[PDB]
């Protein structure tokens, strides 16, 4: 029987927002310490919660609903301070005309759709008729007055489709910034609590390798954008702007934003407004 | 917009150094990579789920009109290969009429094993395909043909522990013919190679560059990989340096002779043509 130690099963968001991180993981050789699974953020959250992964990215709302069973990694997250570029409301009408209107919510999103609902309800005071559908701007704009998108589809709407067809595109990071002055965290990295307690060292090594890979990806953002531009509808300048607009930090100012958002949506989402975010402790 | 080529990659240790090279060079970010066992990756490439990938030799020969092989990279050996074995509780000349389990992930080594047992040792066993599991196989058969990590484990660990004979298929072929052996090649679908000659060529050159780097850094790869395997650093470095990743004239010589000896009993012409990706003139 092969009872040797097993590589941690690690999720990775397939979208462009984590493409520089993937570059870092590859260049550092970290990938060879992982059994990597790539997918969309809602699938990766399901897999980690149900035990198909040991460590991975968790969209914030799903992390908070499972906070007792997950341990978040400090100093890395998928966030913004102001615009995030890839979490948007695309609308054919001004936001204040959306009361009773149809608003399509992309099915891959858990956090941005809730942030959009919070903003529309509690900031602009409109109550639209929401519905979930697969992310497809063309179909959404044929059947609804507005749509909430994330990931590459949202970046495409923001940078290409929106300007082409004269559609308003509202940046959810900027809308939240205007409303609260705060940055925003859309997704965190976490280990399952049982995996973190069974393998504290591997969990720590995975965490440190993520930080190192993230740091390298920041230094080489131009090389990453140059390479990725050959395979995307976005050009090199757009991708480098995107990669540098994203904020991958996760310290005290970012936790402050998570705390406030969790408070405003917890009771109507599925977790306490004062839900406890447990962070992976460093070696003392 | 242009789409990344869909590229297969054998999940076994034999291509872990190559994966290291693909990551370190950044080549991985030009691929949409799929990892699986060699028989699955071969099926996927033939049926169009991949554009470029490793193809176990026998399956390449059965589909040679529709595949274009990459020169100067392959999975082979010159003598022992370490991870393609016959594990037997009896000497090979005592296997006539006995049950021999063929690991289901193999297409080439199982045929090479059959060729050796019939035409070199002159025994005709009762073959059957089953999942690779040395323990279950040794309870249900007198011998078993294994590849990949399972074969490497049998050769380096399980065999010596339980006193089981383990025959290296590369060495048996070398003894019989004096030739090296090629177990798998890399190929592009012909339709993909003709639609995207530049991408196909860049993928090929990136594979060569990554392979070369993996040879240069074999020790770091072994040190890292040993932390996740039952094999230690010295065993992995020995394995990685015993594998022969070349694919030039002497290796094609071996493919030609093997194809000749098994074609009529496998499912392709004995003189099947191996088309190679041509470099830019
Ligand atoms: C930066 C983004 O923000 C995210 C990331 C992951 C999940 C979600 C979600 O809404 O569930 C949002 C992006 O999508 O690019
Ligand atoms: C070096 C090996 O040889 C192979 C590689 C790929 C496929 C096959 C097969 O038999 O189909 C054999 C190994 O398995 O490690």
UniProtKB/Swiss-Prot annotation, chain A:
Q: In which pathway does it act?
A: Quinol/quinone metabolism; menaquinone biosynthesis
Q: Kindly list the biological process annotations in GO that this record carries.
A: menaquinone biosynthetic process
What is the purpose of this protein?
Answer: Catalyzes the dehydration of chorismate into 3-[(1-carboxyvinyl)oxy]benzoate, a step in the biosynthesis of menaquinone (MK, vitamin K2).
- Which parts of the chain span the membrane according to its record? none
Can you tell which superkingdom this protein's organism belongs to? Answer: Bacteria
Alphabetical UniProt keywords = Lyase, Menaquinone biosynthesis
Q: Which reaction does it catalyse?
A: chorismate = 3-[(1-carboxyvinyl)-oxy]benzoate + H2O
Which Gene3D superfamilies does this chain map to? Periplasmic binding protein-like II
Family annotation (InterPro entries): Menaquinone_biosynth (IPR003773), MqnA (IPR030868)
The main enzyme category here is: lyase
- Phenotype of the disrupted gene, per the record: Cells lacking this gene require menaquinone-4 (MK 4) for their growth.
Ligase among keywords: no
Query: A Gene Ontology molecular-function term?
Result: hydro-lyase activity
Which family is it part of? Answer: Belongs to the MqnA/MqnD family. MqnA subfamily.
Per UniProt, what is the name of the gene that codes for the protein in this document?
mqnA
Please state what the protein is called.
Chorismate dehydratase
Q: What is its EC number?
A: 4.2.1.151
The keyword 4Fe-4S appears for this protein: no
- PANTHER family in alphabetical order: CHORISMATE DEHYDRATASE
Any single Pfam family the record assigns to this protein = VitK2_biosynth
């Amino acid at each position: 029987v092969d009872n040797s130690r097993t590589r941690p099963r690690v999720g990775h968001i397939q979208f462009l927002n984590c493409l520089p991180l993937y570059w870092g993981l590859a260049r550092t050789g970290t990938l060879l310490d992982f059994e990597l699974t790539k997918d969309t953020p809602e699938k990766l959250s399901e897999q980690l919660v149900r035990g198909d992964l040991d460590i991975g990215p968790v969209t914030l709302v799903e992390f908070l609903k499972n906070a007792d069973d997950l341990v978040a990694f400090p100093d890395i997250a998928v966030g913004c301070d102001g615009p995030v570029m890839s979490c948007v409301i695309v609308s054919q009408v001004p936001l204040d005309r959306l009361d009773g209107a149809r608003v399509a919510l992309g099915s891959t999103s858990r956090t941005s759709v809730r942030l959009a609902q919070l903003l529309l309800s509690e900031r602009f005071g409109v109550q639209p008729d929401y519905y979930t559908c697969p992310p497809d701007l063309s179909l959404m704009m044929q059947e609804a007055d507005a749509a909430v998108l994330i990931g590459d589809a949202a970046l495409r709407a923001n940078m290409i489709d929106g300007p082409r067809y004269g559609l308003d595109v509202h940046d959810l990071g900027a809308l939240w910034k205007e409303w609260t002055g705060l940055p925003f965290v859309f997704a965190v990295w976490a280990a399952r609590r049982d995996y973190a307690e069974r393998e504290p060292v591997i969990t720590r090594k995975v965490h440190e390798a993520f930080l190192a890979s993230r740091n390298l990806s920041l230094e080489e953002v131009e090389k990453v954008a140059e390479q990725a531009a050959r395979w995307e509808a976005f050009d090199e300048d757009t991708l480098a702007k995107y990669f540098t607009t994203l904020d991958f930090r996760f310290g005290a100012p970012q936790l402050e934003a998570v705390t406030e958002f969790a408070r405003r949506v917890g009771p109507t989402t599925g977790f306490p407004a004062d839900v406890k975010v447990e962070l992976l402790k460093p070696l003392e």
